[PDB]
Design a protein around this motif. Structure first.
Motif, PDB file in Angstrom:
ATOM      1  N   UNK A 121       0.808  -1.211   0.000  1.00 28.37           N
ATOM      2  CA  UNK A 121       0.000   0.000   0.000  1.00 28.37           C
ATOM      3  C   UNK A 121       0.840   1.260   0.000  1.00 28.37           C
ATOM      4  N   UNK A 122       0.453   2.234  -0.814  1.00 29.94           N
ATOM      5  CA  UNK A 122       1.174   3.505  -0.852  1.00 29.94           C
ATOM      6  C   UNK A 122       0.265   4.551  -0.240  1.00 29.94           C
ATOM      7  N   UNK A 123       0.791   5.760  -0.094  1.00 32.58           N
ATOM      8  CA  UNK A 123      -0.017   6.825   0.458  1.00 32.58           C
ATOM      9  C   UNK A 123      -0.845   7.415  -0.665  1.00 32.58           C
ATOM     10  N   UNK A 124      -0.482   7.061  -1.896  1.00 34.73           N
ATOM     11  CA  UNK A 124      -1.144   7.547  -3.101  1.00 34.73           C
ATOM     12  C   UNK A 124      -2.650   7.731  -3.053  1.00 34.73           C
ATOM     13  N   UNK A 125      -3.060   8.973  -3.279  1.00 35.25           N
ATOM     14  CA  UNK A 125      -4.462   9.334  -3.286  1.00 35.25           C
ATOM     15  C   UNK A 125      -5.002   8.984  -4.663  1.00 35.25           C
ATOM     16  N   UNK A 126      -5.218   7.695  -4.861  1.00 35.71           N
ATOM     17  CA  UNK A 126      -5.715   7.188  -6.118  1.00 35.71           C
ATOM     18  C   UNK A 126      -6.677   6.100  -5.695  1.00 35.71           C
ATOM     19  N   UNK A 127      -7.033   5.169  -6.569  1.00 32.20           N
ATOM     20  CA  UNK A 127      -7.961   4.144  -6.122  1.00 32.20           C
ATOM     21  C   UNK A 127      -8.036   2.902  -6.985  1.00 32.20           C
ATOM     22  N   UNK A 128      -8.207   1.749  -6.341  1.00 33.53           N
ATOM     23  CA  UNK A 128      -8.261   0.466  -7.045  1.00 33.53           C
ATOM     24  C   UNK A 128      -9.621  -0.182  -7.018  1.00 33.53           C
ATOM     25  N   UNK A 129     -10.009  -0.742  -8.153  1.00 34.92           N
ATOM     26  CA  UNK A 129     -11.298  -1.397  -8.282  1.00 34.92           C
ATOM     27  C   UNK A 129     -11.172  -2.619  -9.175  1.00 34.92           C
ATOM     28  N   UNK A 130     -11.631  -3.755  -8.662  1.00 33.97           N
ATOM     29  CA  UNK A 130     -11.585  -5.004  -9.402  1.00 33.97           C
ATOM     30  C   UNK A 130     -12.922  -5.242 -10.107  1.00 33.97           C
ATOM     31  N   UNK A 131     -12.855  -5.615 -11.382  1.00 33.11           N
ATOM     32  CA  UNK A 131     -14.049  -5.875 -12.185  1.00 33.11           C
ATOM     33  C   UNK A 131     -13.729  -6.835 -13.331  1.00 33.11           C
ATOM     34  N   UNK A 132     -14.706  -7.670 -13.690  1.00 35.10           N
ATOM     35  CA  UNK A 132     -14.547  -8.644 -14.770  1.00 35.10           C
ATOM     36  C   UNK A 132     -13.348  -9.551 -14.497  1.00 35.10           C
ATOM     37  N   UNK A 133     -12.855  -9.508 -13.262  1.00 43.77           N
ATOM     38  CA  UNK A 133     -11.719 -10.329 -12.886  1.00 43.77           C
ATOM     39  C   UNK A 133     -10.372  -9.675 -13.128  1.00 43.77           C
ATOM     40  N   UNK A 134     -10.369  -8.363 -13.346  1.00 40.62           N
ATOM     41  CA  UNK A 134      -9.127  -7.638 -13.579  1.00 40.62           C
ATOM     42  C   UNK A 134      -9.130  -6.341 -12.762  1.00 40.62           C
ATOM     43  N   UNK A 135      -7.979  -5.972 -12.202  1.00 38.17           N
ATOM     44  CA  UNK A 135      -7.887  -4.762 -11.390  1.00 38.17           C
ATOM     45  C   UNK A 135      -7.735  -3.499 -12.222  1.00 38.17           C
ATOM     46  N   UNK A 136      -8.678  -2.569 -12.070  1.00 39.64           N
ATOM     47  CA  UNK A 136      -8.638  -1.308 -12.807  1.00 39.64           C
ATOM     48  C   UNK A 136      -8.255  -0.125 -11.928  1.00 39.64           C
ATOM     49  N   UNK A 137      -7.553   0.831 -12.523  1.00 40.49           N
ATOM     50  CA  UNK A 137      -7.103   2.007 -11.798  1.00 40.49           C
ATOM     51  C   UNK A 137      -8.089   3.173 -11.815  1.00 40.49           C
ATOM     52  N   UNK A 138      -8.460   3.661 -10.640  1.00 41.36           N
ATOM     53  CA  UNK A 138      -9.397   4.772 -10.554  1.00 41.36           C
ATOM     54  C   UNK A 138      -8.738   6.028 -10.041  1.00 41.36           C
TER      55      UNK A 138
END
Length: 365
Positions: free
Chosen positions: A122-139
């Motif tokens: 985990x980073x401090x990065x103010x970003x976000x992760x979301x898993x869908x269709x079985x693949x991790x997407x960047x938000x």
RNA sequence: GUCCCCUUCGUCUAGAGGCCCAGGACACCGCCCUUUCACGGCGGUAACAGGGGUUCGAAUCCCCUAGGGG
């Protein structure tokens, strides 16, 4: 179901809370800290060490084993190094735009399971992760004006799925706030700035520490000498500072801006007005293509693209230009697209991953 | 070696007796912003070539020494 997470900490509130966040979520939390820059002198080093303290101090006030690492090696080699040539070639590289691809996510993560024996990171990065269709997407994460997605465009789902981002769920204010009510030392600490891993400092002198200065001459869109030049790799399209100009008889009484660098002849085309034509463009060609999706991109796409961290989603159309190259076409014109900088495309909340700007698409005028 | 006109913050200049301890813009500086470099925002510093006159009053009037003018 309680797994091992390694929150990289760079002495900032972000990281801080970010951890205390996982902590609460449960995950056996354990923080790490990277010493990746062989301090120039001392006034800085001083800091460097200091941060670590705030680092520790946080993990301590929390109850987390703070580690240590010296990727300083890789950094310079796999990052800084290139960062230089790029500038040497009179282009403007985004160091930080790689801190993440080579250090923060590759290197870190590696040394996360192979040593620290952790699953998740985990980073401090103010970003976000979301898993869908079985693949991790960047938000992006709420509060777009304060989002950081732009830098993690090199990241690739496999890498992402492995990482966690607490904060990207919160709103920047909350973050500091929480930390305040938690007593965390970091709360109320200026959010860094400048090259990732290296201290914020007056550029000019810093770059001067790794390259010589060949002061050419500052020309003009109307082709006519005007200003000195004291070096050249100290500028970038659209820049306005350090030009001395004070306008003359024929002068829109407005500020002057860069608008094209003349590498060989070692000149410097300058115009007048943050809107001048030679300053705008209608698209670009991007190499070094990275898709969060990490899957072959052929054909044509319709979306938006940033052209500098914190720019502003600019609707555009993407045509599969070639092997890796891609031709982007801005719906409207764009102000000072600068090659070397990275162009990131988003499809709404999702950042699809960007690439390096290499071709400026001039305006007709 | 005769009569004319010029001289203002770093720069381009506002100013034709009191409203100028001189205004603007660009630059330079600083803070804000910001994990690149930059843009941007808000602020700040700084000038009447120099010396005498004349006027209650002088950047602007006359008069003397240093830059262009058939």
């Amino acid at each position: 179901t309680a797994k091992k997470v390694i929150v990289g900490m760079s002495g900032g509130v972000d990281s801080s809370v970010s951890a205390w966040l996982l902590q609460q979520q449960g995950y056996q939390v354990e923080g790490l800290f990277m010493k990746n820059w062989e301090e120039d002198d001392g006034e800085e080093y001083c800091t460097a060490a200091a941060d670590l303290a705030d680092a520790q101090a946080v993990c301590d006030k929390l109850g987390i084993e703070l580690h240590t690492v010296n990727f300083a090696a890789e950094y310079w080699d796999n990052v800084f190094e290139l960062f230089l040539a790029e500038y040497k070639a009179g282009r403007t590289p985004n160091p930080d735009i790689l801190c993440n691809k080579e250090i923060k996510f590759k290197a870190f993560l590696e040394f996360a399971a192979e040593d620290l024996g952790a699953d998740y990171i985990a980073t401090g990065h103010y970003v976000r992760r979301a898993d869908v269709d079985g693949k991790s997407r960047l938000l992006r994460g709420l509060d777009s004006n304060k989002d950081q997605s732009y830098f993690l465009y090199t990241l690739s789902h496999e890498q992402i799925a492995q990482s966690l981002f607490p904060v990207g769920e919160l709103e920047k204010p909350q973050v500091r706030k929480i930390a305040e009510d938690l007593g965390l030392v970091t709360a109320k600490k200026k959010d860094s700035t400048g090259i990732c891993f290296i201290g914020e400092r007056k550029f000019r002198e810093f770059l001067g520490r790794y390259l010589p200065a060949q002061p050419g001459k500052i020309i003009t869109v109307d082709g006519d000498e005007i200003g000195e030049h004291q070096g050249l790799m100290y500028h970038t399209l659209g820049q306005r500072k350090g030009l001395g100009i004070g306008g003359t008889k024929e002068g829109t009484e407005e500020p002057w801006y860069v608008v094209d660098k003349d590498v060989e002849n070692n000149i410097l085309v300058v115009a007048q007005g943050h809107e001048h034509p030679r300053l705008m463009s209608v698209g670009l060609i991007a190499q070094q293509l990275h898709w969060v999706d990490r899957e072959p991109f052929t054909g044509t796409m319709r979306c938006t693209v940033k052209t500098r961290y914190r720019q502003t989603d600019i609707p555009c159309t993407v045509k599969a230009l070639d092997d890796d190259r891609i031709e982007v076409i801005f719906d409207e014109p764009v102000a000072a697209v600068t090659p070397g900088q990275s162009a990131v495309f988003y499809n709404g909340e999702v950042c699809l991953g960007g690439g390096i700007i290499e071709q400026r698409l001039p305006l007709p005028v």
